[PDB]
Amino acid sequence: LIYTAGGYFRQSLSYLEAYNPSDGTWLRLADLQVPRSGLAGCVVGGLLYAVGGRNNSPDGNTDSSALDCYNPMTNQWSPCAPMSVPRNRIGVGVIDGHIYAVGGSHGCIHHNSVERYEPERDEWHLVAPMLTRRIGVGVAVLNRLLYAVGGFDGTNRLNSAECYYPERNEWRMITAMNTIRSGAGVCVLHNCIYAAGGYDGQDQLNSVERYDVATATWTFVAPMKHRRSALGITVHQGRIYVLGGYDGHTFLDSVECYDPDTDTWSEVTRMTSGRSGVGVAVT
Fold it and tell me: Over the Cα atoms of the chain, what is R_g?
């Protein structure tokens, strides 16, 4: 199933819903303990993790350091140890069963810091920080290397990308994208990193480009139907799914699906309500 947690629609949402690309159904599951937007989702050992974000409520607005784990066999959330700092508009990636939390913001603070979570010890450990402060950063893992793509540094939005080598514990700049993107959806499909949509400071984007490590090159591909920033993204059975987002006017419920063999995007479902800044993952 394609799980989507949290998101925003005038207040941090608590929804956890799972989409069945065969059935076409959405499944309402246990609510997040705290409503959150700008979080990231990932899966380790079949458990779904919701990482960082922010609680925008009529009673307050606090960025979240929280890590929470959802078990689909019990339909229960359980808290984990929290990150060292709150991280709104975070990016995350999974290397070797460890969760990497990248960038994000805490109030005025725009993080370049990065930290790693080890589920078998419920511990977070600070690691080599990025060369760039990045909020709304897209994160993808390719051949056990961690890529941080785009984002916003507090002043400029970015087309730069950089790559983290965990065993050297260091970050190295790579070839920049063709397009400046903050709040894009970044994923790995087959053997390439995809960066879809985002915001460049003027327009929400529908363009999609993909990085080939062998040629260290970004190439423009078929665009999505709907421009969107702060979208959710994931890979299910060799296809890319993008969920929701914001197009400068509305919070989208559209779900688009990229087929790499045809280089086409189709619309396959609508979420139960439009929302941006969700955490998406598959288990």
Answer: 17
